[PDB]
Amino acid sequence: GSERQILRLKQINIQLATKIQHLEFSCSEKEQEIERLNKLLKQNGLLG
Amino acid sequence: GSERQILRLKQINIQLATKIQHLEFSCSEKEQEIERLNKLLKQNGLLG
């Protein structure tokens, strides 16, 4: 009944919240990778 | 009673499922930028 429907909604909820946490962490790591590449470009005279 | 959780979880999960799509796009855009910077650095002798 409703108890089981609730449990399943909570499992889906945690799966979605975990994927969000992963994608926020992956986006942050990629912005750090972009900073590091841009700094290398700057140093080699490729960013003005 | 307990059943009021059903709507709350359903609605949260719709919001989270949408946010995952927006974060997937943000992550993909950052990956394309990293590929672009890697190629620039390679063309310029700087990626090994």
From Swiss-Prot, chains A, B:
Cytoplasmic side: 2-48
Chain's gene name: Hvcn1
Subcellular location field: Cell membrane; Apical cell membrane; Cytoplasmic vesicle, Phagosome membrane; Cell projection, Cilium, Flagellum membrane
Upper lineage: Eukaryota, Metazoa, Chordata, Craniata, Vertebrata
Species per Swiss-Prot/TrEMBL record: Mus musculus
Shown residues within the full chain: 220 to 266 of 269
Name recorded for this polypeptide: Voltage-gated hydrogen channel 1
Residue ranges that the Swiss-Prot or TrEMBL entry lists as coiled coil: 3-43
Domain of life assignment: Eukaryota
Free-text note on domains in this protein's UniProt record: The voltage sensor domain (VSD, segments S1-S4) conducts both gating and ion permeation. The segment S4 is probably the voltage-sensor and is characterized by a series of positively charged amino acids at every third position. Unlike other voltage-gated ion channels it lacks the pore domain.
Subunit description: Homodimer; each protomer forms its own proton conduction pathway.
